[PDB]
Design a protein around this ligand. Structure first.
Ligand SMILES: C[C@H](OC(=O)C[C@@H]1Sc2ccccc2NC1=O)c1nc2scc(-c3ccccc3)c2c(=O)[nH]1
Ligand SMILES: C[C@H](OC(=O)C[C@@H]1Sc2ccccc2NC1=O)c1nc2scc(-c3ccccc3)c2c(=O)[nH]1
Lengths: 598, 598
């Protein structure tokens, strides 16, 4: 954890303090090293050249390298810093004379430094790989990368987690150094670099997509863009799509780019060469499958509710000689569901309900292991809080159907719950309407944004005031003042008086204790005037602030539902995307053109 | 008061008008003073050189100083202006030749001017101390402070209220003169200046903290910041903390900086060298003590409410031969609380309630005299309106427990009130939740921002309309139209009809007077359509305006609760902050490092 780097840094400062060699190296004097005139480690992995290269002392570097020739060719102890080449340390400080003298001594330019501070991790800040070439090409030393590649410093290589120098240069906050170094490393390759995967299994194109570097994405696209006729204003250009649509792999680029946990992947979809394709797909074959499947799901759910509304009956058997026993029906035995001939179609409806539940479970069971569990449960782009309520509705319908087949009493307790869950399951289908798009995404944001806070602050006030009212009314007879008879219905009545549905409990034939009157007068201005209206104002404030993000999230999830319902249906029905090129002689590469106007 | 300075200024203008000496001094002519050719006061403390230095007349200054040599070495009458050195007057106007000629005459450069217009007070505007060196170093005369310190003008000194020249230079709206003069006065010190307290008892570091001058705080910190290895992008720097964490004094710097009445002390906490420390403390040992103490307080309060819900009973003794007598229970004698064996644990619960009240009173009794009464009662950072309701709940539980032990009738009147107060006391514990943080601070701002105004304007309308309805319904029999029987329940029914809980009083078997109908139709559109909705809109407007301040206030109070629950618990459990330096040889100075990235 993070009480480790401080301790080893203080120990390293102790070890540079005590020994006069490294202390004079940090001092960079004249009559120190010659007056003294080696392979001893520091606190953890540091020789004499390391602190000299770290504090940029050229004369000390030259004096030590002409004193001991073998000392530059020496790695460090590897407990917090594996390898720790002096070249790799000095290239970050970027001294021309120092890197030239180090290559004159001829250090191992193909070294490897998989240190504990050298890893793609949220602990460290920099992620620079484990190579001096990667260090130079990510810092931006354009005059030094040529001297590094002069001695052939392994233009293709792996490291810890096995990515490459191009992925290192991509995964970086961009600048001019990034684009110039990308062009440089692409030129100095002389299939071998743009095609190599990693141990995460990604093409550099797809890794730039899953990160979100839009300018690197466009500068990689612009090397694969052939131009047709350009008549004045309008320009008809062409794009390649064999990277953007693999259609034979495990994870497509369009499917992977929507599934990241990073909150910048969604902005990649408004760039042209994926936006035109997804808008063509959504204008032709997105809606005329989604809407008809939604209509069939509407018909299935209304068939389920009109089948469940005809629940069978039996009259009462035991008497009700206690005045609060109103149970006028009961559920009869299993033998009489097939006795009446006006219920065979009702059993057919129960069969189609349980068949729909089984088929939706069998569809969604492989849909749980494609990308991660939190990638499928909480990503509002893919629709997590619709998936969980769909699978809960399916499992509860299965449980209540096997309870019906086992013929036990009290079946309505899963029935009403599964019925309201399956009917609110329709709200997933509000992605194919321009009106119904942002409103559901607003309510999905709004629940876990503020209704959680409002319920968490309402609960303590209501739990206080219900107990207060019950203490003040336990000395009161309940046959006239009906409310607050026992404690749970007092809790419920206070909840209702909070949300102002029920009227205030008042009988105008007798007198009421004044403590109730003063406490209810306090409760009115602490609940109904204040907190409900403040909740309304707070949700108006937060709607004013995140009205910007809803349309971007809606575009992200419509591209998500297009790629999901492209992957799901078999390829006998969905067309092959784009136009083929074998009838025009380019050869087995599908292509697309856009007609822009600059 | 403020009808004093005007009178003495008019008298001073009278005294410069009447005497031709000072009038020619203000005139600055040639053939006036030589044609006339002294120690007479003005209206209150003014000789001839004072008005000359005040109106910047160099030839008059030279002529008077070569006429009378002793006259420059002369203070003034001290009733509104004590001392009033001519050097101290002239240094504000900042004339080089005049200050050089005054030092050539050799005035008392170590003078002292504790005038009525010279004090740290909200009456005056400038607070410049009582020294010419302080005057020069706060004005910004960088070419004149050297000539002042040339004759050794007491680089360390006190004044009225006993602060120093460095505190004078700190307590000022900053500019370039301030930072350059701070560096100058630190250099010209040759433990003696950075360590001296005042008669308020503050180090200059702590006084700059309690004022709020962030740039002076950082320029004082930057003289105590040693730098470790700087490898390219990332930089590992070190801070000293023996000023920021005294841990042996009466008032720590972090404890004092949150307790000021100034509304700029809260912005100091987003500066790095205190922010990293308080975030480390809140991430390690802030929440895992606060949350478990909150859970134990939740358990104590729910034990209190489940003990109070089992209030003992006795049936009615006197009959109810009047139709509005519903009192079906009564509180029995003290002898039967220990009669039943199903109430010993209830008496145990009453004992733990009164023990919790006694222990919370014994904890909060020394917490009332640490910083001031209004510093502890109204500062929303420290939590005043939670402290007062906690101590009120404790005192009222003590009163109702001694009333139970004395066995008097009518005990529920403090019981319900203390119960609702102790249950709303949980709302203090919404500081350790990122969701529950700003919402409670919004409601605490909102009550005393606008609900006061809305209640103050609602009261007069409701007091009018209740009297109107009661006058119109005193000619009506109450056995059918139950509402508005007597005046207080008419007041309450109008309050309820304002806040729209109860429905409108209507019986559809008889007729009602038309004055009621027209007045209730006026009351509807003057209350429910208009004023409730306008209150909703006003609180939405003010939420839109002070949505900015809530997160800053929340950061301020989380640093406040960290320093308070660091000071409160004994030091056997809380760790010593930071890392020690004796095992690394620096010596008895705890230190901290930060890993920034520029
Ligand atoms: C929208 C959803 O409808 C419900 O209320 C249904 C049930 S009723 C319930 C009753 C007592 C205790 C927990 C319940 N929970 C339900 O889910 C809903 N809205 C909200 S807002 C804040 C919460 C919450 C989160 C964590 C713990 C306790 C409450 C919440 C919630 O749990 N559900
Ligand atoms: C939030 C608090 O709950 C209460 O109402 C409880 C009691 S009822 C009451 C009845 C008649 C007269 C005074 C009362 N006071 C209470 O405190 C609360 N909210 C507000 S808004 C404006 C005021 C206010 C301030 C100064 C004088 C009169 C009223 C106020 C208040 O005093 N208390």
């Amino acid at each position: 954890w993070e009480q480790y780097r401080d301790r080893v840094n203080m120990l390293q400062q102790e070890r540079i303090r005590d020994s006069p060699l490294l202390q004079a190296a940090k001092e960079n004097d004249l009559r120190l090293l010659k007056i003294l005139l080696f392979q001893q480690r520091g606190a953890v992995g540091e020789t004499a050249l390391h602190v000299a290269a770290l504090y940029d002392n050229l004369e000390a570097a030259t004096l030590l390298m002409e004193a001991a020739p073998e000392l530059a060719k020496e790695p460090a102890l590897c407990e917090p810093f594996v390898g720790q080449t002096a070249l790799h340390i000095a290239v970050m400080n970027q001294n021309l004379n120092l890197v030239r003298a180090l290559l004159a001594r001829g250090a191992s330019v193909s070294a490897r430094a998989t240190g504990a501070a050298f890893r793609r991790s949220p602990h460290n800040l920099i992620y620079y790989g484990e190579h001096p070439l990667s260090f130079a090409a990510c810092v931006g030393s354009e005059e030094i990368v040529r001297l590094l590649i002069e001695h052939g410093a392994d233009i293709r290589a792996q490291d810890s987690l096995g990515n490459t120098v191009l992925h290192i240069l991509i995964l970086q906050p961009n600048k001019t150094f990034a684009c110039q170094m990308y062009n440089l490393l692409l030129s100095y390759d002389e299939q071998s670099l743009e095609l190599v995967p990693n141990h995460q299994g990604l093409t550099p194109f797809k890794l730039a997509g899953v990160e979100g570097n839009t300018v690197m994405f466009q500068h990689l696209m612009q090397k694969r863009k052939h131009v047709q006729w350009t008549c004045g204003p309008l320009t008809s250009t062409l794009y390649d799509l064999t990277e953007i649509d693999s259609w034979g792999e495990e994870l497509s680029f369009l499917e992977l780019v929507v599934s990241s946990k990073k909150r910048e992947a969604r902005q990649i979809l408004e760039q042209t060469p994926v936006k035109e394709l997804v808008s063509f797909k959504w204008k032709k074959y997105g809606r005329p499958y989604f809407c008809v499947l939604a209509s069939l799901y509407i018909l299935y759910m209304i068939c389920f509710t009109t089948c469940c509304i005809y629940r069978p009956l039996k009259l009462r058997d035991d008497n009700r000689t206690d005045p609060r026993d109103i149970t006028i029906l009961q559920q009869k035995l299993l033998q009489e569901a097939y006795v009446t001939h006006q219920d065979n179609i009702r059993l057919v409806g129960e069969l189609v309900t349980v068949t729909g539940a089984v088929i939706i479970l069998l569809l969604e069971i492989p849909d749980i292991f494609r990308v991660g569990a939190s990638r499928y449960f909480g990503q509002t782009i893919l629709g997590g809080p619709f998936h969980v309520i769909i699978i809960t509705y399916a499992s509860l319908v299965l449980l209540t159907m096997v309870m019906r087949l086992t013929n036990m009493n009290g079946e309505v307790v899963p029935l009403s719950f599964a019925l309201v869950l399956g009917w609110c399951s329709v709200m997933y289908f509000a992605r194919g309407f321009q009106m119904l798009g942002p409103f559901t995404i607003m309510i999905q944001k709004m629940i876990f944004g503020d209704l959680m806070r409002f319920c968490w602050l309402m609960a303590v006030v209501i739990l206080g005031f219900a107990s207060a009212f019950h203490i003040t009314f336990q000395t009161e007879d309940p046959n006239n003042l009906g409310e607050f008879s026992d404690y749970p219905t007092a809790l419920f009545s206070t909840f209702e008086l909070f949300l102002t549905i029920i009227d205030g409990p008042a009988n105008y034939s007798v007198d009421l204790p004044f403590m109730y009157c003063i406490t209810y007068a306090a409760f009115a201005i602490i609940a109904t005037l204040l907190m409900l209206n403040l909740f309304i104002a707070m949700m108006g404030d937060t709607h004013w602030r995140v009205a910007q993000e809803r349309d971007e999230l809606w575009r992200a999830q419509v591209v998500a539902t297009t790629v999901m319902l492209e992957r799901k249906m078999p390829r006998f029905l969905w067309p092959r995307s784009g136009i083929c090129g074998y009838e025009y002689g380019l050869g087995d590469r599908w292509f697309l053109r856009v007609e822009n106007h600059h």
